[PDB]
Amino acid sequence: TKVDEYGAKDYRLQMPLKDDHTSRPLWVAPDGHIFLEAFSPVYKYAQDFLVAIAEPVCRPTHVHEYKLTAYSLYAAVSVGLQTSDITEYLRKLSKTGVPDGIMQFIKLCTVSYGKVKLVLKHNRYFVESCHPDVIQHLLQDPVIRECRLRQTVSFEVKQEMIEELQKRCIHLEYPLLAEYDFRNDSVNPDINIDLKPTAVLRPYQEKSLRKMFGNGRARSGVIVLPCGAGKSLVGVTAACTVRKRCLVLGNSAVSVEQWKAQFKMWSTIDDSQICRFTSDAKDKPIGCSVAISTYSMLGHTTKRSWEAERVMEWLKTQEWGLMILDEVHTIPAKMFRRVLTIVQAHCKLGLTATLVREDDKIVDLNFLIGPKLYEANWMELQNNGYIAKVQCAEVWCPMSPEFYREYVAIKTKKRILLYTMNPNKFRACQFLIKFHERRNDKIIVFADNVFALKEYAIRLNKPYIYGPTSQGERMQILQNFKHNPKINTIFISKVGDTSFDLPEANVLIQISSHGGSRRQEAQRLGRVLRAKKGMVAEEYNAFFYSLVSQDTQEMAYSTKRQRFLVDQGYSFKVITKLAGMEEEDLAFSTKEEQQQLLQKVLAAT
Amino acid sequence: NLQEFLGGLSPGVLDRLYGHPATCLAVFRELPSLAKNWVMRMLFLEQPLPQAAVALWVKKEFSKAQEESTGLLSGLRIWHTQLLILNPIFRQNLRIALLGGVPSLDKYAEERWEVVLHFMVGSPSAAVSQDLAQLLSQAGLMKSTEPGEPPCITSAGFQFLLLDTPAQLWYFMLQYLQTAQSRGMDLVEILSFLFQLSFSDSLLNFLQHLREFGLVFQRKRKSRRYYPTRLAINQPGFIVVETNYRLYAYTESELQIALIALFSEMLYRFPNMVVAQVTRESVQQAIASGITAQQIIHFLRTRAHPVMLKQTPVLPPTITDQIRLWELERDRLRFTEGVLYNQFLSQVDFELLLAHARELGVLVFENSAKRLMVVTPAGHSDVKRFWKRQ
């Protein structure tokens, strides 16, 4: 609240300093921001405690940055950490005390939890509460009455208005409890699903699963893990532990196929007990319990086929012990979020690897599913070797004179097609691909503009893939990339970042970017995180190049796009010039070729 | 350096400056490697010796040391060829110099220099001294232009501020001597005191200025005896740099926070720590003020916390490269005053004018294909006179 002569806020008169400040490695700002030291001997204990009570926002190598909020404190209480149980240790760890503001915030957030519980039974959602005064003073506004369908006091609530009531309670200061007591539940018989000994659970996966199952009752929340970290394995383990009917929701055909494959591989459950509620192919969804389907199908708004209508009615009628949702970052979308209310589930677990978006709808996930239970430390995984170390780099390509002339001259938005296609970046990508091809490194080129992708691919006679590409040709190209030594590069379009199971690649070049999309950036980066059989963290075997054009909007987009990666800790090294480019022969070495490319770009319209 | 300062002097001032008490020893210590040996050798000789002996008195290997030492001491004029006997006065003084004839102080020096730097920066609270203010203003690192308003800081001021304490103080004292000559204070008398430290009205004023700078402290209501501080004769870091352009500095003295804010955006200030961000805005603001990326990088490196010393390099390559690129972008467009030519009837005349401009140094850039060139306005008069002369 107090501002120094500079931008930073003043806290000299706010909180004191502990005498043993050197011993205490923890800081506590009044706003809730906490700065932990990664060099302290008690760093591991401090990391565990701060991860338990707060969500990371920036975890560089030296000083980690966390911030705590109501959702994080509710998650702490869910895993069973009381207000004293957290605040006493926070004061002990803190080297400068705990401000009264944070003290009162923690007290209020902890006490305002568990008073209101939401439990669904016999397809009816009852808002139970041991304390009656909570309901007595919660029925002040008329929205609750119009919502409600027309000790331990409970009342039934309308299915459709659950989301509205929950978001209302979040700001009403009475969060709802979504804990599932699968251990004590006789209404829905347990499913015959077990985890085979073959599956191996990594320490971070076990920690995330523990945070989810803080107690005997499963907690509904979101667990963010890298795509290569085995989030599918974590979800399968969660379903197996729940031992009740599980509905997994993918985002595409590839996602549902991969989910079924993961289920069969890691769970002893028989093949016949798993169904694919997919329009392309179905396996009698009503027949078995464990189901894998898609947001599009479940939330489909237009006319429903007869068989799909029967399946949807069966799904609505039945109650699901677990609702797994992969790629939760798309949930807050209208149709996708409608699925949450369409289907009934005790706990809706969420898994993803890039929980970031521009529109401020990510905060809605906290109530749509639950608080962010776990968020894996990418740097720690890199050190442990679970994830391949990546030498993140941004190659700056000077824009050609003429191309810059038209780009600046035109105030329209042909620049997206223009700066994405310039001779300098073309030569840079050609030289980089040549260098990695002679180094036997697998290349996955990326480009949002299909026009630019096709031009580059024809000029380099490479197998570009894109949306309306035939499925058979797509599979053939992927198989050739994985097996045929003569080919070691594939030019994938935006379809690549959506969902796929691609072979591990040693390099990932990105000539063009869709925009300031942290989601796309992280999604494409996750492709090369696949750990090799015997690599090492310090070898930096994996490389990521994000080619950008100097003095163009692409620079702003790249800077706005690398925010999530830098927050994780990756250091994007800038490369102004590439050694050997002048000696190496590359296309567009004369003014004329650039001229024809510019003419084609202009005629593109 | 002191070697430069002493080399930039005349023989008449040099021999006088070679005072008996200390100068012959202070200048001796300057002798890097070998000239010490030769000075000791021919300290006891009253007969000059041929130059060929000195030439051949060093082996073939490492002769460049011999030539450089001989040139340096010829510039110092310790001896004369006399045809290489040393100066009689220097010989006598050196023979007389060779068998012939605190914890609170360092803190005081630190505090005084810190308050001086606080005044140098726009600190509302600082020590007030009109003589110090005018001395800094005339030192070339500060300009007021309005006595009523406090003086501001010039471009050189920020560069001086970001320098390390040793070099900062040394340059400040160099400027002090240069301005002492201008104001009329005898240079030799004040200079000899500095040499004597490492072992009149003008003397009293000079000692007062040194005490204001914090190098000395009488401690006895300005008595004749003085106890020089450590800085008179001539530390761990505290900043931690992340990979996201974030600085965590364990700073309690406001001077360090001000120095960091000069080129970073401050976010939080804890009792024993402060958080800042190195953004384009702050870095380009510093560059426009006059700093260059080298000073910022050196400052962060010297004030580097022990935690980041283990990693090599200490400062992350991404941070260093980003700072350098930010400074470069500002000077992408290089401005240079000049005068253009047009309508060259014949290329022979243009080539002759180009040769003349190259000889005189007037030319700045030339274009043979377009038959044109650019000349600075200073050389514009010369080239115009040449054209008039035809």
């Binding site: 030498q391 780099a393 260098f435 180094r439 070898e539 930096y540 075997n541 490389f543 090294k573 800038v574 490369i575 102004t576 010039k577 590439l578 050694a579 | 990326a293 390559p317 260093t320 490269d321 350098r324 690129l325 470069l328």
Partner: peptide, 15 residues
């Protein structure tokens, strides 16, 4: 063998 490229091993900025 399998050594990192020069432009990633050392800064390519002119400084």
């Amino acid at each position: 063998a399998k050594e990192r490229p020069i432009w990633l091993r050392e800064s390519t900025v002119q400084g």
